[model samples]
Target: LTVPYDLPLPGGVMPRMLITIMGTVKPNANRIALDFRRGNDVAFHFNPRFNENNRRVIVCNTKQDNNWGKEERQSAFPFESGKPFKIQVLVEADHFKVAVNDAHLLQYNHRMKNLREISQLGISGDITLTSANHAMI
Candidate 1:
């Protein structure tokens, strides 16, 4: 039989590091930001547990702006249980864009702190995970 359903970020937790840009874009938003080069090394990694049973996913990005930071970010949209979704992510000179479930999500910027060597992408906050796939682009 197949593995259990995946819930990398189910409960409410927080991001290890996050930078939210101004403005809000719908689920299908695209090219919301212009700069992406500064965050190419950024990656979003998530496990099935975080913060005492809170399923939170986080991204460790290069420090450039650190404009907007947050913890315990919920899924912009609730994914269907047992359904499969795909994501497309890319980073430019100043911002990073991520697409979830074939739907464009948001453009988060890099903190203007160090802007290099994005060490780790940590994600937790869930225990009901089934399967996961990841790729570096």
Candidate 2:
């Protein structure tokens, strides 16, 4: 089932990576994914900045400051926005695997790998936060 926004989660969280096919989020947001900080955190940043008429499959993590990798348009969905996009978050030892749809979008190689950092994640685009399933391996 798809998760809802502003929904209460367990508690503190800070794995190491995340992968998801996030929907067109709201741009101008801090990051693509948000970190759980009791307010609006435990997230990620996908500044396509988040497309409403398009979708973005990607992987992310708090690896490097530029978790977005390089050659980015600063816009999550620079292409188009349709409906029901996904962002499968894969949390690993020290990296992230984000698949836009099925194709690997990026790889966060840990710019700062620690643990217990669930306070940073925001999608640049804005549309609808559908679903986000995470698997820490």
Candidate 3:
């Protein structure tokens, strides 16, 4: 749970970076975060907090100029403790569409709109990662 898998988005993030993660949430988990970032600015922060808002919310936000933007929340909690789940994040021209367990979840429109500025990807939290696969289309 201490290992955070990080990858540099080569040539920065671009459209069609098909990202998928397969993992199991810990039974005692509190939160999990997946981020797209560059320097000190976080282009996207996809966080699912198990104990926040009664464990029924997924928060999305962007941070830049040292301030966090308004949080976009998804009320559809498809995650269960100790259960395996699959998450897909598809980068589009104007946004990222995400899916959970092969079902459409939500889309986060580009706030840090410059795809090239998003040079990194990070995933960490109380999870047991089984797979992280990527491709460009």
Candidate 4:
């Protein structure tokens, strides 16, 4: 288990794929980020911010050619400090559906057109990763 973990998806992503991540948030956590990458570009970026103003949010976006697209945000706070959590990301034809702790969370539409090019899964910040894997549904 480590921070800034990176894993290569051997055959890349496809429809009906399920990616699961298990981790524990540090007690003094401020943020956590997970990403699906296509080389230097990010296909999807999932970030949870624990702001000082108590406005917890989950932000989603894409990056291409070093430019970040507009952010999509969810206000529902599904994670807590000093707690273990399970995250499931299900790949669909046009979007990714995410569930936290077995509950449906948010969906982010595909920004990177080629799914197979998304070959890397990256995670960092504020949490200790215990497990990360992908499987076909």
Q: What is the C-alpha RMSD of each candidate to the true structure, in Å?
A: 13.1, 7.1, 1.5, 0.9
Clash pairs, model 3 backbone? none
lDDT of 3 by residue, 40-66 (tens): 999999999888756568999999888
Number of clashing residue pairs in every model? 31, 73, 0, 0
Best by TM-score: 4
lDDT of each: 0.34, 0.42, 0.87, 0.93
Clashes of 2: 73
Clashes of 1: 31
Query: Per-residue lDDT tens digits of candidate 2, residues 55-95?
Result: 34332322234243343232344333444456554656666
**lDDT order of candidates, top first:** 4, 3, 2, 1
Worst 10 residues of 3 by lDDT: 1-10
Error of 1 at 30 (Å): 27
Q: lDDT tens string, model 4, 106-125?
A: 99999887999899899988
Error of 4 at 86 (Å): 0.3
Backbone clashes, candidate 4 = 0
Better of 2 and 3 by lDDT: 3
Residue 27 CA displacement from its true place in model 2, Å: 13
List the lowest-lDDT window of 10 residues for candidate 1: 28-37
